[PDB]
Subunit: 97 residues, 4 copies
């Protein structure tokens, strides 16, 4: 269908944004007076922390550019997780019979 | 349509609430014994942090008034991000054919 | 209708849970070696922080009982905010004509 | 039905993931230079903190393995709480009459 397939594709897109966001956030933050967004294996963990919108506080950006990257990974999580709710909402609606 | 257009307009409304919230939160908090909601370029970052409901902890209000502003930017995020889920949910429902 | 009215009633219910949760969390936490869930005007702010699931970190429970109260205010927020998304999702679906 | 029953079953599944996640996160983290994911009664509280995506910051994983467990309990919360929104969205749609 569409609903069932657009969602599955959005999760493939979310992984893209995480890896790209992690690796972009490092080069944005690394040379500044700021938190450990200075190694990749920590930026990956930050992405997941942020895209889920759990936001522990153990890591975050302090650069203007690094904070842009943030917004992107934030909405990428919210939106793509919204699709998966939407997909299930029509699967449940697709039982009106 | 409506669903597709009401959502796009809600995101234009969310930007309004962020800028207005940021600039209102500063004047509420600036003269108090509290966290760096004392400059604008930091209040903008707080808005995004809060409207996403990521809530890192690096910034927040300690004034009663500054904490009102918070609630507003909080629900503004939740609600308007809900509309975008709703918009996609009917776009997926709009394929019953 | 129902969708439009059940939601409006759920938000009246959320306010109930906040005030009841705030005032229950204080008496649970006040006498323990733990964070400022020891005054009411701070427990109210914690409720909003938690029901939104923003979770700044400036406040939280450290008692087993105070942590139960938490769960309640957590899901009360998630669920009732879900209804408002659901309400809008059928209002958008209610334009199939 | 399905929508009303699949959701109720997902919440039974969420409890499973919490207890399994809590008890798996402890053995992953206990022997490392990291935060109090070193006792069970604290890992249970972390699960709820994370599955709700409140993320206070008082607790989190610092191990690669402990951070995997995290992702699992994160999406488990997002997804299963999505179903409950979806369930209510079709219950409201199931009044088109
Ligand atoms: K959240
Ligand atoms: K959060
Ligand atoms: K936090």
């Amino acid at each position: 269908a569409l609903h069932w397939r657009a969602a599955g594709a959005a999760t493939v897109l979310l992984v893209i944004v995480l890896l790209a966001g992690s690796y972009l956030a490092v080069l944005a933050e690394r040379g500044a007076p700021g938190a450990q967004l200075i190694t990749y294996p920590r930026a990956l963990w930050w992405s997941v922390e942020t895209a889920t919108t759990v936001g522990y506080g153990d890591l975050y950006p302090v650069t203007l550019w690094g904070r842009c990257v943030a917004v992107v990974v934030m909405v990428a999580g919210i939106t793509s997780f919204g699709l998966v709710t939407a997909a299930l909402a029509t699967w449940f609606v697709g039982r009106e019979q």
